[PDB]
Amino acid sequence: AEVKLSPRDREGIINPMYDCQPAGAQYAGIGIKDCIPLVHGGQGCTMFVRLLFAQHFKENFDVASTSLHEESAVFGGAKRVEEGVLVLARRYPNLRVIPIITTCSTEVIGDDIEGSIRVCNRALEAEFPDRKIYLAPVHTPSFKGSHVTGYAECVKSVFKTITDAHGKGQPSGKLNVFPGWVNPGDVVLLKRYFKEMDVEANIYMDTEDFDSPMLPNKSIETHGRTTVEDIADSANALATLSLARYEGNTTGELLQKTFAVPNALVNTPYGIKNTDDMLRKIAEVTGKEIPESLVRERGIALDALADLAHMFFANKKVAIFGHPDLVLGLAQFCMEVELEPVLLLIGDDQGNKYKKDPRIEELKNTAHFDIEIVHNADLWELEKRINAGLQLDLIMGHSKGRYVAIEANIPMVRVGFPTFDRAGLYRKPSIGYQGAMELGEMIANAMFAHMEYTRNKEWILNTW
């Protein structure tokens, strides 16, 4: 079995898979309590991303703009950054953290972000002697990488900034956990696993409360739960568990280098084996046993998947697109349940890294069929392959690919970010044992509906 990597053969993009770096830096920042990111550039760079988050989560998140205009585009934008910092601090008395996120415009014009931070620190210390506001420089030119890389850059810069200020102190006894770019339901699941294992951990960022209640007292609780103090404490951890090579492992590496916190990168926990291996590594680093409750949740997942695999999934051809950790992990999950992930699409310029991902060899050693991995892909690359005759039984990806599946009449399961065209997906785990089960049942239910709509042996859904 041959797993072939190839790049997109076009210079241009049609139907981009990801957003640009600043968007991902905004996503990282909105998961911090008392944080309002400040995006240094034109207004669209902020407002379109606030909309994107509202599409995925059906919630508002606070992000501010420096409002670069023509004057500042010609003569420099440092005063827009500096004013924006001060306006934020003046109007939001509880604000503590401001990642200052660059854009294509402010990278091209060369504004000196670090210098503006010195200016702002002096101004803020004079104006607000009893406050401390953390300003983190986040360099995210949009003409490199993608929102995946921008998320990773922003996490790293905010951790560098806060841990530079606080340093190393008392050991905490806790794990640091970087799950990557996951849903609130994934964070809920991880918190349960650590609780059942009696392992204290901080999950960075803790986005559980993005799914916020509508409460009798009209309070707004739609915030990140990761605090300054949580972030600072990462220097004191027993170990870091990094779940996502492209979405936070570089922070785990920085904490290893700076503070001697050992980083353990594991496969992102999609599917059974990857979840097993994550829990094995947790046990190894903590000395805690895996509890019976997880053996049971695992078993329930396997029971559910066994009702589907040979009956409905075997020999079915799947295309998967999304963030690289998710694509690679879902392809591994698909093979556990006899699906055939023949086309994997990863959407950015990081192919030199992806060729070295150890999961590629893992996929080569477990595939019963050839796999094509297109990197630097756009979603036109999927559509064009289907137009040329690629026969797929299932697509797994985010909602901006929906018209490809709708028009080709292929069932599609919504995974990754953003999933705006279905309800509630942000609350459903995709990682872990429960998440494998939930994914498999979404796949089956999408196939079942498709059998009904297309009258394809719809009578068979009785005694499976």
Partner 1 sequence: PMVLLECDKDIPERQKHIYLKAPNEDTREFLPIANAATIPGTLSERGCAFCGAKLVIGGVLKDTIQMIHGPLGCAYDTWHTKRYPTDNGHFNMKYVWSTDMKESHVVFGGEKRLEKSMHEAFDEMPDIKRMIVYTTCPTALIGDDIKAVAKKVMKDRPDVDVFTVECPGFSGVSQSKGHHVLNIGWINEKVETMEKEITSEYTMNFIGDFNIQGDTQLLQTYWDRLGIQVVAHFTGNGTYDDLRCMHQAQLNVVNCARSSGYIANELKKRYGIPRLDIDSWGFNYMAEGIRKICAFFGIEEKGEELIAEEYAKWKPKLDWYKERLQGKKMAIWTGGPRLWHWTKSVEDDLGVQVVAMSSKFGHEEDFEKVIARGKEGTYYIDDGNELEFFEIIDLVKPDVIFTGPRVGELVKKLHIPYVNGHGYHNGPYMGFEGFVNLARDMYNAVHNPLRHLAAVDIRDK
96, 174, 245, 298: which one contacts partner 1 (CB under 8 A)? 298
* Interface mask toward ligand CLF for 132-171; x: CB under 6 A: ----------x-----------------------------
338 binds partner 1 (CB under 8 A): yes
Which residues between 305 and 344 bind a second copy (CB under 8 A)?
306-308
368 is in an annotated binding site: yes
Phi, psi for 319 (deg, rounded to 5): -110, 140
Residue pair 336/271 in contact (Cβ under 8 Å)? The answer is: yes
- CB of residue 87 to partner 1, shortest distance in Å: 3
Angstrom distances, CA of residue 356 to CA of 5, 350, 453: 11, 11, 42
5, 34, 76, 88: which one contacts partner 1 (CB under 8 A)? 88
24, 42, 252, 322: which one contacts ligand CLF (CB under 6 A)? 42
3, 22, 183, 415: which one contacts partner 1 (CB under 8 A)? 22
35, 237, 272, 343: which one contacts partner 1 (CB under 8 A)? 272
Task: Tally Cβ neighbours within 10 Å of residue 209.
Answer: 17
- Least Cα distance to 140 among 26, 30, 36, 64 occurs for 26
User: For the sheet containing 340-345, what is the strand order?
Assistant: 3-7, 371-375, 340-345, 317-321, 394-397, 412-414
Angstrom distances, CA of residue 319 to CA of 178, 238, 251, 398, 399: 27, 39, 31, 12, 14
303, 361, 370, 407: which one contacts Mg ion (CB under 5 A)? 303
Strand pairing of 175-178 and 412-414?
A: unpaired
- Which two structure tokens, joined as six digits, stand for 337? 């349940």
103, 268, 275, 350: which one contacts ligand CLF (CB under 6 A)? 103
**Residue type, position 276, single letter:** D
Distance of alpha carbon 83 from alpha carbon 88, whole angstroms? 9
Contact window for a second copy (CB under 8 A) among 62-70, 237-245, 363-371, 435-443: 435-443
Q: Which is nearer to a second copy, 159 or 270 (CB)?
A: 270
The DSSP call for residue 32 is B
8, 22, 30, 447: which one contacts ligand CLF (CB under 6 A)? 22
Distance of alpha carbon 233 from alpha carbon 255, whole angstroms? 11
230 is in an annotated binding site: no
336, 340, 357, 438: which one contacts partner 1 (CB under 8 A)? 336
Phi, psi for 380 (deg, rounded to 5): -65, -35
59 is in an annotated binding site: yes
Helix (H, G, I), strand (E, B) or coil at 226: strand
Place of tokens 């990773």: 152
84 binds partner 1 (CB under 8 A): yes
Contact window for Mg ion (CB under 5 A) among 50-58, 144-152, 261-269, 386-394: 50-58
- Which two structure tokens, joined as six digits, stand for 187? 């964070």
* Interface mask toward ligand CLF for 47-76; x: CB under 6 A: -x----------------------------
416 CB contacts (<8 Å, ≥6 apart)?
A: 321, 322, 323, 326, 397, 398
- CB of residue 218 to partner 1, shortest distance in Å: 5
141 binds partner 1 (CB under 8 A): yes
Given a second copy, Mg ion, ligand CLF, none, residue 104, with its beta carbon under 5 to 8 Å by kind, binds ligand CLF
221 binds Mg ion (CB under 5 A): no
Contact window for a second copy (CB under 8 A) among 242-250, 301-309, 316-324, 339-347: 301-309
193 binds partner 1 (CB under 8 A): no
Which residues between 221 and 280 bind a second copy (CB under 8 A)?
none
440 CB contacts (<8 Å, ≥6 apart)?
A: 304, 305, 308, 337
Q: Which is nearer to ligand CLF, 68 or 431 (CB)?
A: 68
Q: Which is nearer to a second copy, 111 or 206 (CB)?
A: 206
Residue pair 322/341 in contact (Cβ under 8 Å)? The answer is: no
Question: 444-450, long-range: CB within 8 Å, 24+ apart, which pairs?
Answer: 444/308, 444/312, 444/313, 446/394, 446/411, 446/412, 446/413, 447/312, 447/316, 447/393, 447/394, 447/411, 449/411, 450/409, 450/411
423 binds a second copy (CB under 8 A): yes
198, 277, 284, 452: which one contacts a second copy (CB under 8 A)? 452
Q: Which residues bind ligand CLF (CB under 6 A)?
A: 20, 22, 41-45, 48, 103-105, 142
Q: Which residues bind a second copy (CB under 8 A)?
A: 51, 54-55, 58, 211-216, 295-300, 302-304, 306-308, 399, 402, 406, 420-424, 427, 437-438, 440-441, 444-445, 448-449, 452-453, 458, 461-464
Question: Residues annotated as binding site?
Answer: 59, 303, 368
Question: Residues annotated as binding site for Zn(2+)?
Answer: 368
